[PDB]
């Protein structure tokens, strides 16, 4: 019975995913070795030095983590909370992006609707253009709401 | 519980590969955090902004999506056909690369065979090497044509 | 049935991780799409030029793969193995770094331990500060920089 042998094989496939993490460096090699901006480098001989990166690897990881002024490394565990906390103050910009961004969207559809609907509204040609443009333009145009909302929302809490 | 509990255990183990996709985002951070060139940058404190990157995040993906205006977003639908139509016609240069590339080893192979065959060919007071050399030039050279399929195809594919 | 259809599904999940590699080419586009370092212009049509990359692939790959002079294409496979062997001797930088890596860790422990232990030691009138600094300082100071490990081992091991 090989099915059971195949059953654990199902689990091995899970192991395969962890294998992928090394591929991430291969992409970096590809990045330097294949150019820069879209494809539309002789150095690949040197890019093989990526393998040698194992020697170099203490430098990128320890530099921030422990940093030259040793004794700080125990202090760094406390700084990571501070780095997130310090930047999180500005993180509210989330509310910022949808109010401004969504606002422009209302604007282009407004232009498309006013053109098509106004044209169809004329029909007889008396004064339909007045009611169609004023009503649609009144709701979208007046819907304008300046920024500073996040500032007030943040200030009220702290 | 055992096999049934173990079966779902397989998909639970399978679940991580979707989690793994963030590593693609990590590679971006890696490029900056790894000193740019292969692993053979203090700014990671700055990379901490990536947590806050959510604020930045709706602008880069959407900018390409809607362009510098939601009116232009209407334009994106037209250019999308444009990019594919434009690149579909000139894109055939793919064949040109692989056509030349196939040809690349074909040249290396006959040249190597000539060195070995030409030298062993004489094996007496006779000009046997003249025979292996003439066959090399006539067969390889005549195996192709002066006409470029890349150019002819672009002019005959409308 | 059901479980069997679902059993092979894991095998599809294995395919799913293989699917993920394509993201690496996307990451190239994303690097450009992210402005520069993560996310914290009109060129989105230029990122589309990645599709044009099929024609481009001849230029990055041909020079690296076949090089300028011919007969190099077989040479590319041999040199790749050759640089690993050549650079392997230099690969020993693996150990020089771990020695320095653990060495600084001794440093954070040395100043941290002496500061706390020596501070509490003054409570005793005799000369405790002498024994506290001398013992900690003796192990780190004397062990600091023992000798050239990589030079001696690399020179003997070629």
Nearest CB neighbour to B57, from listed C39, C57, C73:
C39
- Quick check: A71 and C112 CB within 8 A? yes
Contact C31, B31 (CB under 8 A): yes
CA–CA distance, C12 with B14 (Å, rounded to integer): 10
CA–CA distance, A61 with A23 (Å, rounded to integer): 19
Q: How far is the first Cα of chain A from the last one, in angstroms, to the nearest whole number? A: 67
Q: Which of B90, B121, B143 is the last residue of a domain?
A: B90
Nearest CB neighbour to C40, from listed B20, B49, B91:
B49
CA–CA distance, A52 with C86 (Å, rounded to integer): 11
- Quick check: A38 and C27 CB within 8 A? no
Answer yes or no: do C145 and C100 share one domain.
yes
Element (H, E) at A99: helix A93-122
Chains that touch C (3 or more CB pairs under 8 A): A, B
Length of chain C: 158
Separation in Å, CA B83 to CA A10, A67, B63, B96, B156: 42, 48, 17, 20, 21
Q: Which of C65, C90, C115 is the last residue of a domain?
A: C90
Separation in Å, CA A155 to CA A89, A92, A93, A98, B105: 11, 11, 14, 20, 70
Contact A156, A148 (CB under 8 A): no
CA–CA distance, B72 with C45 (Å, rounded to integer): 13
Residue recorded with tokens 């040609």: A125
Instruction: Give the 3-state secondary structure of residue A4.
Output: helix
CA–CA distance, A4 with A6 (Å, rounded to integer): 5
Answer yes or no: do A97 and A123 share one domain.
yes
Answer yes or no: do B84 and B10 share one domain.
yes
CA–CA distance, B150 with B90 (Å, rounded to integer): 10
In angstroms, what separates the C-alpha of A123 from chain C's closest C-alpha? 40
CA–CA distance, C36 with B133 (Å, rounded to integer): 55
DSSP one-letter string for chain B: --HHHHHHHHHHHHHHHHHHTHHHHHHHHHHHHTTSS----TTHHHHTHHHHHHHHHHHHHHHHHH-SSHHHHHHHHHHHHHHHHHHHHHTTHHHHHHHHHHHHHHHHHHHHHHHHHHHHHH-SSS-HHHHHHHHHHHHHHHHS-SS-HHHHHHHH--
Answer yes or no: do C101 and C148 share one domain.
yes
Answer yes or no: do C109 and C76 share one domain.
no
In angstroms, what separates the C-alpha of B141 from chain C's closest C-alpha? 17
To probe the interface with A, which of C33, C73, C108 has the most A CB atoms within 10 Å? Answer: C108
Q: Which of B38, B55, B90 is the last residue of a domain?
A: B90
Answer yes or no: do B46 and B100 share one domain.
no
Answer yes or no: do A100 and A44 share one domain.
no
A131 CB contacts (<8 Å, ≥6 apart)? A121
Contact C118, C130 (CB under 8 A): no
A-B CB pairs within 8 A amount to 100
Closest CA to A28 of A42, A14, A49: A49
CA–CA distance, B143 with B110 (Å, rounded to integer): 12
- Quick check: B48 and A109 CB within 8 A? no
In angstroms, what separates the C-alpha of C124 from chain B's closest C-alpha? 44
Residue C43 structure tokens: 């060129």
Answer yes or no: do A2 and A44 share one domain.
yes
Answer yes or no: do B128 and B142 share one domain.
yes
| Phi–psi pair at A122, nearest 5 degrees | -60, -50
Chain B positions in Cβ-Cβ contact with residue A11 (cut-off 8 Å):
10, 13
- Quick check: C64 and A41 CB within 8 A? yes
Number of domains composing chain C:
3
Write out the residue range of the structural domain in which residue C74 sits: 56-90
Residue C20 structure tokens: 């993920």
Answer yes or no: do C47 and C86 share one domain.
no
Element (H, E) at A95: helix A93-122
Separation in Å, CA A101 to CA A110, A136, C44, C104: 15, 20, 18, 50
Answer yes or no: do B82 and B101 share one domain.
no
* Burial profile C101-113: b = 16 or more Cβ within 10 angstroms, e = fewer: eeebeebbbbeee
Chain C positions in Cβ-Cβ contact with residue A68 (cut-off 8 Å):
none
A13 CB contacts (<8 Å, ≥6 apart)? B14, C10, C11, C13, C14, C17
CA–CA distance, A46 with A99 (Å, rounded to integer): 49
């Amino acid at each position: 019975n090989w099915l059971w042998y195949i059953r654990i094989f199902i689990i091995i496939v899970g192991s395969l995913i962890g294998l992928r993490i090394v591929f991430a460096v291969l992409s970096l090699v590809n990045r330097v070795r294949q150019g820069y901006s879209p494809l539309s480098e002789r150095d690949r001989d040197r890019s093989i030095r990526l393998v040698n990166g194992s020697l170099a690897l203490i430098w990128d990881d320890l530099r921030s983590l422990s940093l030259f002024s040793y004794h700080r490394l125990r202090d760094l565990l406390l700084i990571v909370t501070r780095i997130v906390e310090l930047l999180g103050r500005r993180g509210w910009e989330a509310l910022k992006y949808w109010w401004n961004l969504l606002q422009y969207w209302s604007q282009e559809l407004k232009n498309s609707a006013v053109s098509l609907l106004n044209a169809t509204a004329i029909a007889v040609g008396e004064g339909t253009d007045r009611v169609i443009e004023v009503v649609q333009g009144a709701s979208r145009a007046i819907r304008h709401i300046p920024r500073r909302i996040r500032q007030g929302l943040e200030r009220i809490l702290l």
